[PDB]
């Protein structure tokens, strides 16, 4: 139907905007701490600690499958990256500190993305 196509165009355009959002957020992680899944070879007990792992590569796979229906879903996954790190790692670690800086810096990017998604429908 024409309605299904129109909805598919809306999803494609959301995916384009979320792709730019993801690039901007990932630039705020220049050390690449959050680039890939925590390795279960190197941290074999990770899943005993963290029930829903997340990382930027895993978000990118979901994005390119047009797997985000709205910005809330995408933010949920970004928040898991931060929140998982801040639980697994102690305050006095490079990992925790990197998450705090990602959170603070990403908030700015996400504040305007919310406006762009509400504005452009």
From Swiss-Prot:
Residue span(s) of domain Bromo: 9-113
Signal peptide: none
Tissue localization of expression: Highly expressed in testis.
Top-level taxon of origin: Eukaryota
Subcellular location: Nucleus; Chromosome
S-S bridge residues: none
Covalent link Glycyl lysine isopeptide (Lys-Gly) (interchain with G-Cter in SUMO2), residues: 41
Purpose of the protein: Scaffold subunit of various histone acetyltransferase (HAT) complexes, such as the MOZ/MORF and HBO1 complexes, that acts as a regulator of hematopoiesis. Plays a key role in HBO1 complex by directing KAT7/HBO1 specificity towards histone H3 'Lys-14' acetylation (H3K14ac), thereby promoting erythroid differentiation.
Complex and partners: Component of some HBO1 complex composed of KAT7/HBO1, MEAF6, ING4 and BRD1/BRPF2. Component of the MOZ/MORF complex composed at least of ING5, KAT6A, KAT6B, MEAF6 and one of BRPF1, BRD1/BRPF2 and BRPF3. Interacts (via PHD-type zinc finger domain) with unmodified histone H3. Interacts (via PWWP domain) with dimethylated and trimethylated 'Lys-79' on histone H3.
Protein name: Bromodomain-containing protein 1
Species whose genome carries this gene: Homo sapiens (Human)
Full-protein interval shown: 555 to 674 of 1058
């Amino acid at each position: 139907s024409m309605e299904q196509v129109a909805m598919e165009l809306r999803l494609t355009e959301l995916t384009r905007l979320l792709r730019s959002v993801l690039d901007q957020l990932q630039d705020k992680d220049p050390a690449r701490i959050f680039a890939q899944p925590v390795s279960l070879k190197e941290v074999p007990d990770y899943l005993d600690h963290i029930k829903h792992p997340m990382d930027f590569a895993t978000m990118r796979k979901r994005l390119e499958a047009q797997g985000y229906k709205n910005l809330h879903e995408f933010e949920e996954d970004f928040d898991l990256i931060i929140d998982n790190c801040m639980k697994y790692n102690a305050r006095d670690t490079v990992f925790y500190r990197a998450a705090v800086r990602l959170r603070d810096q990403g908030g700015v990017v996400l504040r305007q993305a919310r406006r762009e998604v509400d504005s452009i429908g």
